[PDB]
Design a protein around this ligand. Sequence first.
Ligand SMILES: CCCCCCCC/C=C\CCCCCCCC(=O)O[C@H](COC(=O)CCCCCCCCCCCCCCC)COP(=O)(O)OCCN
Length: 186
Amino acid sequence: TDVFNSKNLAVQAQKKILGKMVSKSIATTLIDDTSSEVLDELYRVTKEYTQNKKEAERVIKNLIKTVIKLAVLHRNNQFNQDELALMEKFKKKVHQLAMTVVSFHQVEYTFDRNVLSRLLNECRELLHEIIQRHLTAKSHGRVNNVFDHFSDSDFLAALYNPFGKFKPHLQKLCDGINKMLDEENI
Ligand SMILES: CCCCCCCC/C=C\CCCCCCCC(=O)O[C@H](COC(=O)CCCCCCCCCCCCCCC)COP(=O)(O)OCCN
């Protein structure tokens, strides 16, 4: 007759639900060994600047956590019409941030702390608004912890100081960002 036939379906649902959420979630955004180089450099410049190994650890952990959750949401079509448009603006703004970070190193002395703070904060606000309907307070805190550290004016000025400890880090960071850009991952 009619065995419990539903189970072959949620299973079909479960089967592919997984198919788009977990794979891309980590197979694609962070396990990209180049993403890890960039994150490692972000760690080093933060540790170098804060003189605190565990405050630097927490910044990068917050960042990695945010990116993953963001990916999973996206791949799961949990975003509505307005969150997708926001996400698309976010991606454009991060692309522009990435190229501006590089250009401020590649073109001598064009570093402008206000341009970078404006772009970083625009990313920050985009992220808050994207996750507003789907994440809790902890995630908003992670977003602020990450962007508070990187948009810090004195942090930015030191990172682009060509005479100090940070010069070789900026060079490595830029190599990594450019690699992501060239692979079209950002
Ligand atoms: C030194 C001063 C500035 C330092 C920067 C501090 C770092 C904070 C800034 C930005 C956070 C980066 C988050 C990137 C999110 C990318 C988009 C995303 O998460 O969604 C996913 C994107 O999917 C991808 O495969 C591409 C992005 C995955 C890698 C991004 C995560 C890397 C983590 C470290 C990146 C650092 C960026 C540095 C920028 C200056 C899912 O959407 P999609 O449909 O697959 O992509 C559509 C395009 N076909």
